Design a protein around this nucleic acid. Structure first.
Lengths: 122, 76, 385, 153, 134, 121
RNA sequence: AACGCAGCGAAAUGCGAUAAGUAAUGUGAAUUGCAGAAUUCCGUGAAUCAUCGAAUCUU
RNA sequence: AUGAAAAGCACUUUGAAAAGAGGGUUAAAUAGCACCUUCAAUGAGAACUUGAAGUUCCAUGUGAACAGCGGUUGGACAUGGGUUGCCGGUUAAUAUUCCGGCACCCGGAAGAGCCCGACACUUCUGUCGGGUCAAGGGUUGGGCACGUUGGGCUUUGGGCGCGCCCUGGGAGCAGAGGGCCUCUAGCCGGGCAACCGGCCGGCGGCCCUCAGCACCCGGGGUAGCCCUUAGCAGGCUUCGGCCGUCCGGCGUGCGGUUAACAACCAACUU
């Protein structure tokens, strides 16, 4: 047994990720029992096991998040956490198409009388 | 704690399924034999005077019931 | 007068030789009751007169019984260490080595160590030592251990035998890779140098100082890199008292100004430790070794499990060190709680394995010497070391 | 040696105060390492810890004075400090006499010694402070009955 | 003189950035000049020192002392080479910290990444030369 | 032409309430079950009092999370150690953690459980 | 704002039961008071390093 | 804000300790992390510690500081531990919360607690016996006859025994004597030794004879209990008869005049 590398975790299905998470949590339990009155090399493993559990949970979480974004592709209403977060102001700001819209009369002026590329000699 | 005055009722109380245990208490200073049976809810005590009647009762109740003799100075 | 039946009772010849493993009572092998003396060395320089002193010779004769049973104990040690030197090899398990050593000792001394009082009459002086690689001392496999020695192990074998509370403690090291061989000679020289230096009125700091020149005068080639041999400063020899492996006086293996003298009638354990590392060891690993303290606090134990276990230790082991397996063989079922409570209270000290830094190699040799009134007797000397 | 913990523990186990616990001076060493209720309890059985008897406080003199008052030895005027009502209330004297007189009249009516008409007349006479005590009431009844007997015509 | 606007010529800011520099930055600060043999072999003037290579001391009370670095101790801006020690009162030997600027690297610790580091520095130096020599 | 009314009090008519049928979950995935058996049970307590409980009262003293109740403690020990309990008594220590005394069923011996379940070994 | 989290910490700093942090990218041998690791670089890669686009985020 | 770098002081010695004197590091230490009484015990030291006599909680330790004197002591310091509807018990520290029992005149209940004892006991551990119920007032006693209820006790008659003592079988166990064979130890003659002959200790498994304790099966006798009839288990006499000289109560004439008398029990108050 040893520290779990995050590289190999990314290539495992969900159910195998769940199985390894249970083993890691179980090992941390009994190893945390022995901590009373003992100083030495025993402690290093529980620190590694805690961080090992964290890596697995992120991998399970990340693979779950990626699947949800795939399912909710081409969907009008996405969940709140899957929706982009920039700031409150940027989300209420007008859409790019809306802020750049023009009227019929303004479009007619620009079509026939836009700003020209002119030069004046001396 | 409740008393059984009649003999016949006492065996039926000792016969019901929730009779966990029973004991015999001897009072030599008065010649009283106390038959106590413990059920789910109550402890039933039957006070006896004649030891001749006592011997008939001990072998009449169903054998499954555990009976003790209540020794003096029960250790903690 | 009644003439009763008297069937012929063939006088069995006493056995003259030992077996593999050793099971023959030692008294069978020495039918006259006299056991061999150890190595006898005259004191040096201003103490040479001691050899022929009439008054000191008679004084020694007052303790003839002390001398002769100890000589028995030393002879038992030599035969058991010969067997051990012939048996230990890569591929042997620690469990079977320990069981074989104890059975041989117990058979030879005639004490199964199951009945009350029996372990206090004679037998093991302390738990055997089976120390691998970086472990210098105080490692013993507990029940169920499955570890097998490998080619690259360095194993320390430390055997103690007592008779009537007089304990012979001697220890030696084996290795099988020739690059590890030089370590044994280095430590051997210091032990042998101690033998030359030991004596009445000798100052212990000089022994420690001499040890320093010899250890740093040796080096060993390991895997292409050279390491000087360093004394393990924080280990020391000791005096021996009845039924107690450690007395109050120490003989260091580094220089000091200590003005403690070796004295007539004393017994000393001359032990040396060498290391390729820092030269001091720390406690690390699973604990197997324990010993009741002579200066034991007389705390009124609050735990009943402890209340029993302590008496069992005193009755069966007294102040002699013991191990867990010595409890298992008595029939105590689950007892660690009382034992750990006793350790926590401080009545009974637990002796964890002692290790130098990871990747280093250590060697150990030990002898017991008796400081007799006329001469020094290195009683545990043999042809191996 | 500090035995303050031992004295507190002994008092709790002995079921007494801390001022009654006696610890043997000549065995302060064994008491010193008691440091538990069981060990303190063991030293009680071994006679090392003993509960002192209570200080003597006797009511013998109080009994002697009470007996002397029953015969009238310490009842003088100089021995009274309160009012006669505080010492012996008139309200309880009146209540005692009323019940005594009423109880006497009740059994006389039941036994037939007097009829209801004489009983009723005597009941209000008693309520009116006519008879000092029991003897006066019976003396009155005897005189009245004789006169009632006398009218034979 | 300083020209670029982003560069600061303030003593206070320079002292703060140097003493409070993180571990990655402290590696670049703790650089040592290569030996002339390696300087002409790799065309590299200096390298960030690393634990695992032999070093010669050129300044201090321990001049002309050769030994391999046992620890690159970045917190104190010092390194420890072998056999440079000082005895305490107890007689225990403690390593003496030497600044990487007072030493010269006579042998390198040859790793796969040090090849890239040396290749990057070398390729840059002649590349500059061709541009300047035009 | 209008329905009769037996009372002079007008009451709001009953109209149906449609259940919520959101077109998107406000939270993408439900949270993992918080405070499972590993989070609840932290470590047994090795102290003179706690060990005394094991030998005499057949009870095990544990240190659990301060925000767990007796129902969760009983379930945690059963699914993690396969040990049953007749009752559990919990207190919150002054340091801020929860101490749980768990009396085991009479069929099992707690002292063995400490050895087998590695409580103290 | 409160309460917790470090092998050994009380404060500060940092973090949130994934807790003195995780993932990903860059760089490329350390951290350091004592402990304790990793490549042994051919994938696999220290550190409270830098960056930081993925997550966790107790009351 | 020591010093470039902790190189921050090894070791010896005095002192209970703090520290001092040497010695050492440094370029520099003119840079040292301040850059009420008596006795006894404990202890370097006792008026204010202890025994006997007259989170502050708990345990262990303790240099400085504090406890306006001291301090070995502490609510101070250091490090551990402690907080889980009645009775009894349990802890160094929690209990109506833990454990056991039992619940929402008699049973509980004497088996509990409390006093006395005896023997053991290093401790793991106690074990077994005994007890522990002049005036001011009350309560009884009302009788004879008759009839009726409990019949308090006894005799006869009827029913149910097995308490003891006498007789048959067994079970388990204990000890003394004799027989079978197995292991270990001492003495004598012989024998190079091996081995062969005689005496002696521990044996020590099995069989036979004698003495003692506890248990089971089958046959005899009571000695105890329950029920009825008669007397109240009775005494006197004409010997017919009479008294009911048994206790307890209830109903009908009385008598109620000296119960205004006796006995018994009780506190206090001029």
């Amino acid at each position: 047994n040893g520290k779990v590398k995050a590289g190999q975790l990314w290539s495992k299905n969900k159910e195998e990720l769940t199985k390894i998470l249970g083993e890691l949590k179980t090992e941390l339990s009994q190893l945390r029992i022995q901590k009373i009155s003992s100083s030495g090399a025993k402690l290093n493993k529980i620190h590694d096991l805690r961080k090992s559990i964290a890596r697995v949970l992120t991998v399970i979480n990340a693979k779950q998040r990626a699947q949800l974004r795939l399912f909710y592709k081409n969907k009008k209403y996405l969940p709140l956490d899957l929706r982009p977060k920039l700031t409150r102001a940027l989300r209420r700001r007008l859409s790019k198409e809306d802020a750049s819209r023009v009227l019929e009369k303004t479009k007619k002026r620009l079509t026939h009388f836009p700003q020209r590329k002119y030069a004046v000699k001396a | 704690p409740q008393e059984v005055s009649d003999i016949k009722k006492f065996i039926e109380i000792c016969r019901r399924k929730d009779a966990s245990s029973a004991r015999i208490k001897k009072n030599p200073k008065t010649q009283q034999i106390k038959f106590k049976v413990r059920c789910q809810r109550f402890l039933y005590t039957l006070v006896l005077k004649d030891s001749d009647k006592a011997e008939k009762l001990k072998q009449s109740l169903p054998p499954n019931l555990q009976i003790k003799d209540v020794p003096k100075r029960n250790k903690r | 007068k009644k003439k009763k039946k008297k069937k012929n009772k063939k006088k069995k010849k006493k056995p003259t030789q030992q077996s593999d493993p050793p099971r023959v009572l030692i008294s069978h092998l020495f039918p006259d009751g006299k056991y061999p003396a150890g190595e006898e060395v005259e004191y040096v320089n201003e103490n040479r007169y001691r050899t022929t002193s009439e008054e000191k010779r008679y004084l020694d004769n007052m303790q003839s019984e002390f001398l002769n049973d100890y000589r028995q104990a030393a002879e038992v040690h030599r035969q058991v260490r010969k067997w051990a030197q012939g048996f230990v090899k890569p591929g042997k398990s620690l469990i079977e080595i320990s069981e074989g050593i104890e059975d041989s000792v117990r058979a030879l001394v005639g004490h199964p160590g199951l009945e009350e009082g029996d372990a206090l009459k004679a037998g093991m002086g302390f738990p055997v030592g089976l120390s691998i690689n970086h472990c210098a001392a105080h490692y013993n496999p507990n029940s169920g251990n499955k570890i097998v020695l490998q080619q690259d192990d360095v194993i320390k074998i430390d055997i103690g035998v007592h008779v009537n509370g007089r304990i012979v403690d001697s220890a030696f090291t084996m290795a099988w890779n020739d690059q590890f061989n030089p370590l044994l000679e280095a430590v051997r020289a210091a032990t042998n140098a101690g033998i030359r230096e030991a004596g009445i009125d000798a100052r212990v700091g000089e022994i420690g100082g001499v040890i320093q020149e010899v250890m740093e005068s040796y080096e060993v080639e390991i895997n292409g890199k050279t390491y000087p041999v360093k004394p393990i400063r924080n280990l020391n020899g000791h005096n021996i008292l009845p039924y107690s492996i450690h007395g109050t006086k120490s003989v260091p293996i580094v220089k000091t100004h200590d003005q403690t003298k070796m004295e007539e009638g004393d017994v000393f354990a001359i032990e040396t430790f060498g290391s390729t590392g820092k030269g001091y060891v720390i406690e690390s690993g699973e604990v197997s070794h324990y010993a009741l303290r002579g200066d034991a606090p007389k705390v009124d134990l609050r735990l009943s499990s402890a209340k029993s276990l302590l008496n069992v230790i005193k009755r069966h082991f007294g102040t002699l060190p013991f191990c867990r397996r010595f409890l298992d063989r008595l029939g105590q079922e689950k007892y660690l709680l009382g034992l750990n409570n006793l350790v926590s209270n401080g009545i009974v000290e637990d002796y964890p394995p002692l290790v130098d830094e990871k990747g280093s190699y250590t060697a150990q040799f030990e002898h017991t010497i008796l400081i007799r009134p006329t001469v020094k007797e290195v009683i545990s000397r043999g042809d191996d070391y | 040696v500090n035995l303050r913990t031992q004295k507190r523990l002994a008092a709790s186990v002995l079921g007494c105060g801390e001022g009654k616990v006696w610890l043997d001076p000549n065995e302060v060493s064994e008491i010193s390492n008691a440091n538990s209720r069981q060990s303190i309890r063991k030293l009680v059985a071994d006679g090392l810890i003993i509960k002192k008897p209570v200080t003597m406080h006797s009511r013998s003199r109080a009994r002697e004075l009470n007996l002397a008052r029953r015969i009238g030895r310490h009842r003088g005027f100089g021995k009274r400090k309160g009012t006669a009502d505080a010492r012996m209330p008139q309200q309880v004297l009146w209540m005692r006499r009323q019940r005594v007189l009423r109880r006497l009249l009740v059994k006389y009516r039941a036994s037939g010694k007097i009829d209801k008409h004489l009983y009723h007349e005597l009941y209000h006479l008693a309520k009116g402070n006519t008879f000092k005590h029991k003897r006066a009431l019976v003396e009155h009844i005897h005189r009245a009955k004789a006169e009632k007997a006398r009218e034979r015509q | 003189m300083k020209v670029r606007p982003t560069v600061s010529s303030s003593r206070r800011k320079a002292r703060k950035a140097h003493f409070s520099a993180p571990s990655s930055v402290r590696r670049v600060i703790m650089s040592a000049p290569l030996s002339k043999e390696l300087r002409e072999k790799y065309n590299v003037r200096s390298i960030p020192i690393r634990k695992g290579d032999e070093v010669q001391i050129v300044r201090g009370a321990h001049k002309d002392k050769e030994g391999k670095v046992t620890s690159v101790y970045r917190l104190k801006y010092v390194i420890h080479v072998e056999r440079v020690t000082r005895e305490k009162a107890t007689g225990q030997t403690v390593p003496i910290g030497i600044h990487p600027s007072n030493v010269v690297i006579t042998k390198l610790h040859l790793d796969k990444d040090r090849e890239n580091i040396l290749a990057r520095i070398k390729a840059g130096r002649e590349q500059v030369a061709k541009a300047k020599g035009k | 032409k209008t329905k009769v009314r037996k009372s002079t009090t007008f009451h709001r008519p009953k109209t149906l309430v449609l259940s919520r049928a959101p077109k998107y979950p406000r939270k993408s995935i439900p949270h993992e079950p918080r405070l499972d058996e590993h989070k609840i049970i932290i470590h047994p307590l090795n102290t003179e009092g706690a060990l005394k409980k094991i030998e005499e009262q057949n009870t095990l003293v544990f240190i659990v999370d301060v925000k767990a109740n007796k129902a969760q403690i009983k379930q945690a020990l059963k699914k993690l150690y396969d040990i049953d309990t007749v009752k559990i008594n919990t207190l919150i220590r002054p340091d801020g953690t929860k101490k749980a005394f768990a009396r085991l069923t009479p069929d099992v011996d707690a002292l063995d459980i400490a050895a087998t379940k590695l409580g103290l070994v």
